[PDB]
Amino acid sequence: ISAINWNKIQDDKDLEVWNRLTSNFWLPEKVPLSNDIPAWQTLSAAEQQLTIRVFTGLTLLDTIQNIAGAPSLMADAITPHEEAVLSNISFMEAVHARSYSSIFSTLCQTKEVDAAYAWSEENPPLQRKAQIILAHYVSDEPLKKKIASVFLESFLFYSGFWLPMYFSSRGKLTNTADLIRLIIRDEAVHGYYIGYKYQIALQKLSAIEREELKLFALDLLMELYDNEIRYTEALYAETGWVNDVKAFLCYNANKALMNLGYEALFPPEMADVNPAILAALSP
C-alpha cells in the first residue's frame, strides 16, 4: 500500500466521478419531507401500504450495496483513486438506505412500518433478487460482480422509484420525490462508473471470454427481469399501474445494458414510458 497521489491521476474518469459524487453530497435532513404530510393523508390505505413496502424493498437493496456490493468491488479496483471513489459509493448507499427511515419517521406510523419490514423478510421475489445479487458479490468472479452491481444500480430499484415519480406527477409526495431524485442522481453515476470499469476489464480478455460474459449478462438480466415482473405484479396488483411499471422496467433495463457497453435489448413498444413519468423523473 502506497500513499495515494491525486496529482498523478491514471484515469481522468476517476477524478471526474470523485468530484461529481462528492459534490453531490446530501443528507435526508436537508429535504423538507414534513411538507409531504398533507399529501400522505390523501393516499388510500392501500396506496400507503404499497409505498411503505416499495421503500422497504429499496432499503434492503441499498443496505446490501452498502454492506456487500460496493466494498466487494474494492479488491477489484484497478487504480488507487477507484478505491477512494468506491468508498464514497459505499457511504452514500448508507445515506440512501438511511433516507427511507427518515421518510417513514416523518410520514408513517411505527406499526405499519414494522409490518412492511416483516413483509420484506418474507416476500419471495424480493428475497430472490437479494439472494441472486449477494451470491455474485461473495463469489470470486470480479466481472460478474460488476455486472450484478450495474443491474442493481440501473435496473432493480426502478420498480420502486416509479411510485414516488407517479405520485409527484399528481402533486403528491413531491418532497419525497425530490429526495428520490437525489438518490437517482447518485445511482445513475454509480452504474455508469462501475459499468465503465467493467468495459475496461473486458478489453484485457480474449474474444471467447468477452463472449461468455456477454451471454452471462443477458441470462442474468432475463433471470432478474422475470423475477422483477413477479415482484411488480404482486406489489402493484389492482392499482392499474402494473403495465406502466413494466414499461419503466424495460426502459431502465436498456440503460443498465448500455452502461455495460451492450446494445438495448427491449424494443420501443415494451419500453414506452408515459411522458408524465419521464417528466417527473427529470423536471
- Which positions from 44 through 103 interact with a second copy, judged by CB under 8 A? 56-57, 59-60, 63-64, 66-68, 70-71, 74, 80, 83-84, 87-88, 90-91, 93-95, 97-98, 100-102
In the complex with Fe ion, which residue's Cβ is closer, 39 or 164? 164
The least distance separating a second copy from the CB of residue 32, rounded to whole angstroms, comes to 17
**Separation CA 156–CA 130 (nearest Å):** 10
Is 225 an active-site residue? Answer: no
**Separation CA 71–CA 58 (nearest Å):** 19
Is-contact 193 13, C-beta < 8 A? Answer: yes
In the complex with a second copy, which residue's Cβ is closer, 9 or 220? 9
**Separation CA 130–CA 224 (nearest Å):** 10
Is-contact 148 137, C-beta < 8 A? Answer: yes
3-state helix, strand, coil in the chain (%, to 5): 80, 0, 20
Map residues 105-144 to x or -, x wherever contact with Fe ion holds by CB under 5 A. ----------------------------------------
**Separation CA 145–CA 135 (nearest Å):** 9
Map residues 151-180 to x or -, x wherever contact with a second copy holds by CB under 8 A. ------------------------------
Nearest to 96 by CA among 227, 188, 195, 228: 188
Residue 122 annotated as binding site? no
Nearest to 67 by CA among 145, 137, 161: 137
The least distance separating Fe ion from the CB of residue 206, rounded to whole angstroms, comes to 30
Return the H-helix or E-strand segment holding 136.
helix 124-138
Query: Is residue 239 close enough to count as binding a second copy by CB under 8 A?
Result: no
User: Which residues does the annotation place in the binding site?
Assistant: 62, 93, 96, 153, 187, 190
Residues that bind a second copy (CB under 8 A): 1-7, 18, 22-23, 25, 27, 56-57, 59-60, 63-64, 66-68, 70-71, 74, 80, 83-84, 87-88, 90-91, 93-95, 97-98, 100-102, 104-105, 110, 113, 117, 120-121, 130, 134
List residues with catalytic annotation.
100
